[PDB]
Design a protein around this ligand. Sequence first.
Ligand SMILES: *[C@@H]1O[C@H](CO)[C@@H](O[C@@H]2O[C@H](CO)[C@@H](O[C@@H]3O[C@H](CO)[C@@H](O)[C@H](O)[C@H]3NC(C)=O)[C@H](O)[C@H]2NC(C)=O)[C@H](O)[C@H]1NC(C)=O
Ligand SMILES: *[C@@H]1O[C@H](CO)[C@@H](O[C@@H]2O[C@H](CO)[C@@H](O[C@@H]3O[C@H](CO)[C@@H](O)[C@H](O)[C@H]3NC(C)=O)[C@H](O)[C@H]2NC(C)=O)[C@H](O)[C@H]1NC(C)=O
Ligand SMILES: *[C@@H]1O[C@H](CO)[C@@H](O)[C@H](O)[C@H]1NC(C)=O
Ligand SMILES: *[C@@H]1O[C@H](CO)[C@@H](O)[C@H](O)[C@H]1NC(C)=O
Lengths: 444, 48, 412
Amino acid sequence: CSELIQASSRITEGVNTKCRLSGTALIRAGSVGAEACLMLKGVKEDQTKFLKIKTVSSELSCREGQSYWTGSFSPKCLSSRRCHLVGECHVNRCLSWRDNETSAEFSFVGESTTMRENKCFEQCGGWGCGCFNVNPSCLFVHTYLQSVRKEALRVFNCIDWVHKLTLEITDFDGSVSTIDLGASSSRFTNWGSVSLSLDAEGISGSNSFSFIESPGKGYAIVDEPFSEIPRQGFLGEIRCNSESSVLSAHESCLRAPNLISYKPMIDQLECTTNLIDPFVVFERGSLPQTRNDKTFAASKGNRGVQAFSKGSVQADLTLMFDNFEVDFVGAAVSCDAAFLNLTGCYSCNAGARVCLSITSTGTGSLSAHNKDGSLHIVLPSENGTKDQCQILHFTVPEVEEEFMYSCDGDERPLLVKGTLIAIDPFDDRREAGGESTVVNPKSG
Amino acid sequence: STGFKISSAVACASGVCVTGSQSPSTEITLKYPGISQSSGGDIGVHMA
Amino acid sequence: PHLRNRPGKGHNYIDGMTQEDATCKPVTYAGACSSFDVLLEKGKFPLFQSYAHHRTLLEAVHDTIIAKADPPSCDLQSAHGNPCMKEKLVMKTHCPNDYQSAHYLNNDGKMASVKCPPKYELTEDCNFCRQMTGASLKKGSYPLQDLFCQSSEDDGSKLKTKMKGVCEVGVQALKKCDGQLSTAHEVVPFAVFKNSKKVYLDKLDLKTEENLLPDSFVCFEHKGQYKGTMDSGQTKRELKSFDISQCPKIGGHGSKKCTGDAAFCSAYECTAQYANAYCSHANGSGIVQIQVSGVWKKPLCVGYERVVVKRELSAKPIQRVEPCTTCITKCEPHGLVVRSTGFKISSAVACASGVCVTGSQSPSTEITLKYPGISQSSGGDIGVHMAHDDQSVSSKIVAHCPPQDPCLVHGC
Ligand SMILES: *[C@@H]1O[C@H](CO)[C@@H](O[C@@H]2O[C@H](CO)[C@@H](O[C@@H]3O[C@H](CO)[C@@H](O)[C@H](O)[C@H]3NC(C)=O)[C@H](O)[C@H]2NC(C)=O)[C@H](O)[C@H]1NC(C)=O
Ligand SMILES: *[C@@H]1O[C@H](CO)[C@@H](O[C@@H]2O[C@H](CO)[C@@H](O[C@@H]3O[C@H](CO)[C@@H](O)[C@H](O)[C@H]3NC(C)=O)[C@H](O)[C@H]2NC(C)=O)[C@H](O)[C@H]1NC(C)=O
Ligand SMILES: *[C@@H]1O[C@H](CO)[C@@H](O)[C@H](O)[C@H]1NC(C)=O
Ligand SMILES: *[C@@H]1O[C@H](CO)[C@@H](O)[C@H](O)[C@H]1NC(C)=O
C-alpha cells in the first residue's frame, strides 16, 4: 500500500540486518473504523511485514478553562443576649459591628478555619424586656456554615473544542499499542514518533453553558453562563478551590453577600437560608442531553465530555524513523483462506465490510491484492481456522473481483462476490466522499 | 424502557454514533449507526 | 528542641572518635554533639531538616541498618599511599573548619570516612589535611552528604541505576561511549536499598505513610519530676528523654505508667494514675517509599550528592541529505509538464534567466506550468522549485530543453 524504497534496508540469511529505517512516510489517515497500511517488502516469500494504523474514533473533546467546586451547606448560629452597658452593648458598637469580628461571649470558638460571620441586633430595653435600663439591649449572633453531604461537585466551562483522533498501532510482531493525539501534534511512540496534521479544522467554536462533574459518578450540563463571581439564587453561590475546602467549609471559600436569613424573634433566633442544591441540578441535567443540535456526552473512559456536531476533517498522519524488525521472521509460513461474505455500501464514509475465513498453521498475515493493485486486503493468520474482517471502499452497486492472496508463500487466487446497499442522501449532486467524518446528531 | 422514561439517547457502533431527542417516554427510536444495520453486530446505547 | 529526641539508640558518634561520649552517646536535649549539631543549622542539610525525625547515617550504622565498609576509615596518617581517596575525590563537598574527620555513604551502600592525622584538620573542600597551631579540633565527624536513613526489609537486589544519556555518574560506569562527553558536576539524588548498591535516580518521587510503631513516638520526662528518674531539686526547667519500651502496650504488661496524646492512647495503654512520662506522636515520622521504575519501594537510605557526571550531548543532531530525482520533466507545446513519481506536487515555480512563472494545483503526481519568458523559444536550462507532500526530496531541479516551435502551440 506504501513502500519505503528510498530508506529500505536489508531486513545474511536468517539474521536481521535492519539499518534503522529513517525515511518518513506521508499517507492519508483512514476514515473512522478504517485502517492505514504500510508495505515492508524484502525477499519474495519472506519478510512482508505490515504496520497498521487503525482509526478507532474521532471525538470533539473539551478544553476546560476556569473551574471551581461547590456543595451543600447549612448554617449554625450561637446567640448571646446582653442588657445595655454590658460588655460591648453600647449602641454605637451595636450598629457598627463588623461581620468579621468575633464577640467576647463566643471565645470558646476561638480561632477556627470555618466560614463564619457575626451580627449584632438591637432589641427592647426595659423591665418588660428583662433589663432595668431602658436603652436597647443587644443580641450577638455568630453563624458558621457546615457541609451536609460528604460530596462535592466541580463546575467548569469549555472555552473551545478540539478535534482528537484515537489510533491503534498494529506494530510489527505485536499490536499492543494504542495512542490518542490532537491537531498538529506528535507522540513519541516506539520506533520514532507519529504526528497528525488534521489540517481541516483545529477547533469547533465555543459555548455558553456550564458543566458539572461528580467524581466517580459522571458529568452533567447546566444551562447557565459560567460566572466567575458568586451570585445569590444561582449555582455556585458558595464556591471553593478544592474538594477538601467544600467538605470542610473552609474560610477560603467565596460566597455572595447576604445569604443567611436571620429571624431575631423574642423567644429564640432562627438562622436559616434557602440554597440551590447542586446535587439536584446535577441530577437534572445528566450528560446525554442535546442542545441546539450538539448532544454533549461522556467521553470514553469518562475522562471528559464530547460534542457531537455535523462536520468532517481531513487527517494526514506521518510516520518517522519507523524501525521495528527482528530476525526470527525470516522463516516462511503457509495459510489457507476462504471468502465468507460481503456487506455494506459504496462511496460511503462507513465503507464496505469484508470477512475472510483464514485456515493457517501458525502466525502470519495476508496480502491479497487485486489485478490493478488498487484494493488491498490485510488480515492476520493464526493456527487453526479463524474468522477475521476488514473494511474497504467501493464505488459499484455489485462487487465481483479476484485478488492475488499469498501469506509469505505461494500465490493463490481469491474470488469475492456480493452486492452493496445504496445510501439514500435525499439530495445528491455529484458524490458523497470518503474523508474522516465526525459523529453528528440526527437533527443536524 | 420499562418504567423510567427516555428523553435523549445515543447509539455507537464501531466509532460512528447517532443521536436522538424526544419527549420523556418509555420507548425511543433512533436511526441506525453507519452500516451496523446491514452488518448486524453489537451496538452500544447510552441514554438519559 | 524536640529534634534532639533521637529515634532508636541515637548514637551520633563514630568509632575512634570516642572523646565526646558524654553528649554524643544518646543525643538528648542537654548537651552538644559536633557530629549532630551541624545538621540543625539553618540553610544547611535541608533534606534531613525536613525528615528530621529519621535516623542519620551514624545512627543507622549503630542500629546495624547500614554496614561499615572494608577499611572503615583508612587513616591518611597510615594509608595515604593506598587507593582509598577515590569515591570522595569525585564529590564536591564543603567542610567547615576544625574538623578532623568526615563520614559519607560509599558506592557499595556502606559507610566510609576520611580521618586526618592527629592535630590536622580537613580543608574547605575536605580533600586535604592542614595543620593550624593552637587550634581545638572538634571531637566529631562532619556528615558529608545530605541524606536520611530508615529500617527496611524490602529487597532490592535487582535495583540498578537507570539514567538516560549518562555515560558515567559518580564512580559508576553506566556504559561505554565514544566521542563528545559533556563532563560536569551535578546534584544527583540517590537511594540505597537492601542487598544492593547506590542507585542514582533521575527523579525523586517519594511519599510517607504514618504508623504506630515505637519509632513514631517521642517520649519525654521532666528533670526534677516527682516519682521519676532524676528526682532531685533543679535550678532550671529542662526535659529528659524517655524509653518507650517501658510503657505497656494496649492489653499488655509494662514497667512504667505512661500517658500521651490521642495517637499514643490509641496505640498504647494510657494510665489513669499519676504518669511517669509524656509520649507525643512524631511530628513527621513514618515509612518513606521511593518510586523507582514506576513502582514504589522501601529504601534503606535516601539522599543527594554533588558528583561528576559525563553525558553525551548527541551522536548526530540531524541529517539532511536528499539527492532525489524521482521525477521526469518534459517541455510540451501545451505547457511545461513535470510528472513526479510518488510524491504529489501542489504548487511550483519555474526560473529562467530572471523571469519566473508560478503554478498552483491540487496535490498530484504531475503539474503543468506556463513557459517563463522566451525560454520556450530559446530552449536552454530552466530551474524548477516545487513543494512536495513528503520529505527527503530535493526541491530544486533543472530541465534542459531545445528550442520549441510556437506554431503547434497556437495552431488552431
Ligand atoms: C458474514 O460473515 C461474518 C464473519 O463470520 C459474520 O460476522 C461475524 O461473525 C462472527 C463469527 O464468524 C460472529 O462472532 C460471534 O459473535 C457473538 C456475538 O455477536 C459471540 O457471542 C460469539 O462468540 C462470536 N463467535 C462465534 C463463533 O459465534 C459475529 O457475531 C458476526 N457479526 C455479526 C453477526 O454481526 C456475519 O454475520 C456474516 N453475515 C452474513 C450476512 O452472513
Ligand atoms: C542559436 O544559437 C545559439 C548559440 O549557439 C544556441 O544557443 C546555445 O548554444 C550553446 C553553444 O553554442 C549551447 O551550449 C551548450 O549547452 C549545453 C547544455 O545546455 C552544454 O551541455 C554544452 O556544454 C554547451 N556547449 C556546447 C558546445 O554544446 C546552449 O545549450 C544553446 N542554448 C540552447 C540550446 O538553449 C541555440 O540553440 C541556437 N538556436 C537555434 C534555433 O538554432
Ligand atoms: C459595666 O460592666 C461591663 C462588663 O459587664 C463593662 O464592660 C462596662 O465597662 C462597665 N460599665 C461601667 C464600669 O461603667
Ligand atoms: C477583619 O478583622 C480584623 C480584626 O478583627 C480587622 O483588622 C479587619 O479590618 C477586618 N476586615 C475587614 C473589616 O474587612
